[PDB]
Amino acid sequence: MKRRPRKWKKKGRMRWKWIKKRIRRLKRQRRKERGL
């Protein structure tokens, strides 16, 4: 992906790596549901 380093800073946020893990799981669910 494009990554903005601003997001790595941990004030007010959960850790970016785990957010990246969450984003891919949602993408796989959406993509499977359509049937590709």
Partner RNA sequence: CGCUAUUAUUGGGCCUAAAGCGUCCGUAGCCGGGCCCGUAAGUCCCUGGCGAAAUCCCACGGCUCAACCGUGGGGCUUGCUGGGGAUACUGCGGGCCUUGGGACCGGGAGAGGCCGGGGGUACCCCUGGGGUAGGGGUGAAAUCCUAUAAUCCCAGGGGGACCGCCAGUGGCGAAGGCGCCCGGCUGGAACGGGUCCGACGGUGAGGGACGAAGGCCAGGGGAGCGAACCGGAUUAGAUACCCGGGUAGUCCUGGCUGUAAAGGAUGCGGGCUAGGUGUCGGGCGAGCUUCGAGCUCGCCCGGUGCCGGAGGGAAGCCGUUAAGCCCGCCGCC
Partner RNA sequence: GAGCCUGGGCUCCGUGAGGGGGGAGAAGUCGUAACAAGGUAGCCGUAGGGGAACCUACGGCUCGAUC
Distance between CA 11 and CA 32 in Å, rounded? 34
Total residues in contact with RNA, by rule CB under 7 A: 20
Tokens 């969450």 belong to 22
Do 16 and 8 meet the contact criterion of CB atoms below 8 Å apart?
A: yes
34 is a contact residue toward RNA (CB under 7 A) = no
With binding defined as CB under 7 A, does residue 17 bind RNA?
yes
Judged by CB under 7 A, does residue 21 bind RNA?
Answer: yes
The residue ranges that bind RNA (CB under 7 A) are: 1, 3-6, 8-10, 14-18, 20-22, 26, 29-30, 33
